[PDB]
RNA sequence: AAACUGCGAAUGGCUCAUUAAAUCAGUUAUGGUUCCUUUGGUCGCUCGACUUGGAUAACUGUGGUAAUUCU
RNA sequence: UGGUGACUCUAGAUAACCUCGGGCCGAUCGCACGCCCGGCGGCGACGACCCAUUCGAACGUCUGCCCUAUCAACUUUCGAUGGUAGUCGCCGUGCCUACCAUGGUGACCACGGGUGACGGGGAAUCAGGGUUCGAUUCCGGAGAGGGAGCCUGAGAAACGGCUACCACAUCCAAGGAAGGCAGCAGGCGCGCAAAU
RNA sequence: UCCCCUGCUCGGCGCCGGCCCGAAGCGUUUACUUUGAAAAAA
């Protein structure tokens, strides 16, 4: 039980670090639209 | 003193167990448990003051022995366990369901559910920690500690988790237009809509709650209990829906409902 | 011509028995006794008369009306298990050891100056 | 730590002039007139009736459209005209003061009973209530201070355990008819 | 039965002698410490016997003291 | 990594320590029975270094106590005020040491004395304000003749626990032994005053 | 009786990068007055 809650935690924590990723490049990528606008 | 207190008096009890004046001199003190002293219900006060299946002390006794009371999925065979806000009593034999929770006014009710809504528990978050490996670790307002939540579950937020299992299924934030339940005080099981929420460093912070009528009040942040996303509770309410309506309709409504039955 | 009403019936199967108010209407008499009682609540319930417990009959003021609790369990063995002895005692099927306290209590006291086998010899 | 009650007041307040000769002479004439036993029941209706309108005082010296004036002077108004001392026409929270001390001597049963037709005196109705011959809905009553409602005042009648309503004779009936027996026999 | 072991004997009950910023009352803090028990988590995470040892109770037997819940 | 209004917070990595009066890492028990070629299994009890929670306890912060000037100045290397470094304590801190500077409170009443003073929630009287009481069933504090010291236990300076002093006091073959009803009944003394 | 005689970094709640409103952030300090919280039971 401690190695499938480490493998799903593991697997959860990966899936919310890629998609604060993909919010933060889409923040840098709106602050690079409002400098060139 | 020189120790830890055992006995409790009658009158020197919270107000919302109901107990009557004279039939004794000691108060059932409950059990160290989950839950605290003033914001709890004894197994024995509620077999025999709310169910009335017991008469006297012994035969509570006999039922709990019997272990036919379940709490949150367990058996528990104490007679003075506390039973807090939100927990699930169950009765195998007789076929029921039971969630404490407040009415209008400053007291527990007896209210039924279906066995499907019997299966969960929504509980309050307290603190965000961190274990030995840097592992998160979370802590509910009824002790209970779940390991490996998710990154999304902040201090002030609501959870649901799983009985026969113990773990998270999905969650509520703490934001602007939740409904929300008020725990303690003089606003006491008042459902509402949350509308500000005002911040005092150094000390409580204050929240400002909109009924379902356009009445306010305001609580602290401690006693704010989120049951729903938006304007939908996620179980079931009791009658009345804590709408706290004041003395005058319910002077009304109570003469309305004597013409009508007479 | 004594009827009897009951009220506030509900039964529990976790104690394998019936509780009810009972209403009894005996104008003109005294208080009726509970054994009549007992097996008028037999007639009524279909049930044999030696399950029926029935105590704390008030009669209210003015004669005619008494109030009391009664209830009917289902085989002798539950009537025999959860119940207060008082009540099997007026039913004739218990009794205790003719002692008081102060007797247990100096017998208690005399048992605990010695020490060994003849703790049981001092209390005779 | 013994489990009572201790919860206990007096009734009644007794007057600040012990020889006086005009309230003397209204208290006999009360007592006289309504067949009370002694001044402490006419000083206890005198304190009940200076508790209402001292609560009456206090409610009017307040301000109009107060929720719990309106509230708990609605619950005095509807107490005042169930116990039969106050009109339907007279619901108002200046009308309390109006009344007097007759209007709560007359919703006794004492003289209820004298007044309802099955009494000669007053005194006697005193005697007939005191000796368990009447019934206030299929209920008797052993005293005459019961200040009756207005919802209750068309069922009082003789008790059924009495030779008045039709029961059982008492003793010097049943003493003089054996006594007749034993004459005739 | 007895006796070893564990737990409770720090609770409850009685009294107002001392105590005049002392006690206590409302509001606050422990980010300056401890916490039996209950509840929940943790309890093959460490890289190195198919059950070990001898002492004492209860018991048996022999005694002292005028006397102790003595030994 | 994550959080607070704020860490010398939690977590991470590196180098070691790790107390023979010694941290953990199971040589315990009951019931129902078993599957599969000896090995492999469930429902409970007990114990557990820890972390959170619960009953708490403890020390602090702000404000609030009857009378008296025939009490006007008080305290201080026998700590009074503050600073540094330590001992001890479960922790903060003159709580205590060694060295420094002379500080700290007071007419807005310090300090000293008295109280027929346990404090409060409360009670009697009461137009409106006020005056008096609160030993007394609830909450907190103190004590078991009075001071003092301690074992065990998580929690006691415990007294229906122990050890010495004085006052009182029981038994004795005179060498010794044994005590604390301001617990429930009851007795003596006391007094106008209080029950089986 | 009813609306009016405090402003200079992100949104979204709208309109055409801009305006507007709402908010990170702030406004010489007090007493007084009104409301709200908490304020054991008896």
């Known amino acids: 039980k401690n190695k499938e809650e480490a493998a799903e935690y593991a697997k959860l924590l990966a899936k919310r670090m890629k998609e604060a990723k993909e919010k933060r490049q889409e923040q840098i990528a709106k602050r690079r639209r409002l400098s060139s606008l | ?124 978050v307290r603190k965000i920690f961190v274990g030995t490996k840097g592992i998160p670790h979370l802590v509910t307002h009824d002790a209970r500690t779940i390991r490996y939540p998710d990154p999304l579950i902040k201090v002030n937020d609501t959870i649901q988790i799983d009985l026969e299992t113990g773990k998270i299924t999905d969650f509520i934030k703490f934001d602007t237009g939740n409904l929300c339940m008020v725990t303690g005080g003089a606003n006491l099981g008042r459902i509402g809509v949350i509308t500000n929420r005002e911040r005092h460093p150094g000390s409580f912070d204050v929240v400002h709650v909109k009924d379902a009528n356009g009445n306010s009040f305001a609580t602290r942040l401690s006693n704010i209990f989120v049951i729903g996303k938006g304007n939908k509770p996620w179980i079931s309410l009791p009658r009345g829906k804590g709408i706290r309506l004041t003395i005058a309709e319910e002077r009304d409504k109570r003469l309305a409902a004597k013409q009508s039955s007479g | 011509t004594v009827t009897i009403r009951t009220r506030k019936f509900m039964t529990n199967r976790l104690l394998q028995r019936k509780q009810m108010v009972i209403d009894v209407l005996h104008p003109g008499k005294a208080t009726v006794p509970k054994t009549e009682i007992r097996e008028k609540l037999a007639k009524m319930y279909k049930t044999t008369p030696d399950v029926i417990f029935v105590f704390g009959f008030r009669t209210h003021f003015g004669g005619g009306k008494t109030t009391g609790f009664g209830m009917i369990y289902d085989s002798l063995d539950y009537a025999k298990k959860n119940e207060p002895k008082h009540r099997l005692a007026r039913h004739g099927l218990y009794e205790k050891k003719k002692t008081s306290r102060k007797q247990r209590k100096e017998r208690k006291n005399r048992m605990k100056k010695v020490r060994g086998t003849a703790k049981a010899n001092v209390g005779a | 730590p013994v489990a009572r009650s201790w919860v206990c007041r007096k009734t009644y307040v007794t007057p600040r002039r012990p020889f006086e000769k005009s309230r003397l002479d209204q208290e006999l004439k009360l007592i006289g007139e309504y067949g009370l036993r002694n001044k402490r029941e006419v000083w206890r209706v005198k304190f009940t009736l200076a508790k209402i309108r001292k609560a009456a005082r206090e409610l009017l010296t307040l301000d109009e459209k107060d929720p719990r004036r309106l509230f708990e002077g609605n619950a005095l108004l509807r107490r005042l005209v169930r116990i039969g001392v106050l009109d339907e026409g007279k619901m108002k929270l200046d009308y ?62 003789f ?8 029961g059982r004779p008492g003793r010097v009936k049943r003493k003089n008819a054996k006594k007749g027996q034993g004459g005739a026999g």
């Not at chain 2, 195998?92 to 066995?115: S, W």
């Not at chain 4, 059924?160 to 309503?165: A, D, H, M, N, W």
């Open chain 2, 1 to 124: 003193a020189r120790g830890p207190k055992k006995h409790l008096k009658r009158v020197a009890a919270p107000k919302h167990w109901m107990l009557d004046k004279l039939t004794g001199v000691f108060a059932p003190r409950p059990s160290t448990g989950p839950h605290k002293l003033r914001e709890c219900l004894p197994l024995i006060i509620f077999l025999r003051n709310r169910l009335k299946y017991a008469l006297t002390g012994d035969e509570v006794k006999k039922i709990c022995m019997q272990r036919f009371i379940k709490i949150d999925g367990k058996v528990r065979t104490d007679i003075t366990y506390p039973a807090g806000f939100m927990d699930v009593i169950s009765i195998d034999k007789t076929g029921e369901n039971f969630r404490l929770i407040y009415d209008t006014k400053g007291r527990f009710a007896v209210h039924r559910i279906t066995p499907e809504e019997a299966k969960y528990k929504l509980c309050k």
């Open chain 4, 96 to 157: 309390i003061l109006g009344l007097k001390i007759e209007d709560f001597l007359e919703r006794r049963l004492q003289t209820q009973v004298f007044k309802l037709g099955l009494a000669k005196s007053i005194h006697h109705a005193r005697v007939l209530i005191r000796q368990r011959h009447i019934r206030v809905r299929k209920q008797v009553v052993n005293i005459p201070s019961f200040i009756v409602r207005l919802d209750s005042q068309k069922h009082i009648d």
């Open chain 4, 159 to 166: 008790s059924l355990r009495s030779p008045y309503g039709g």
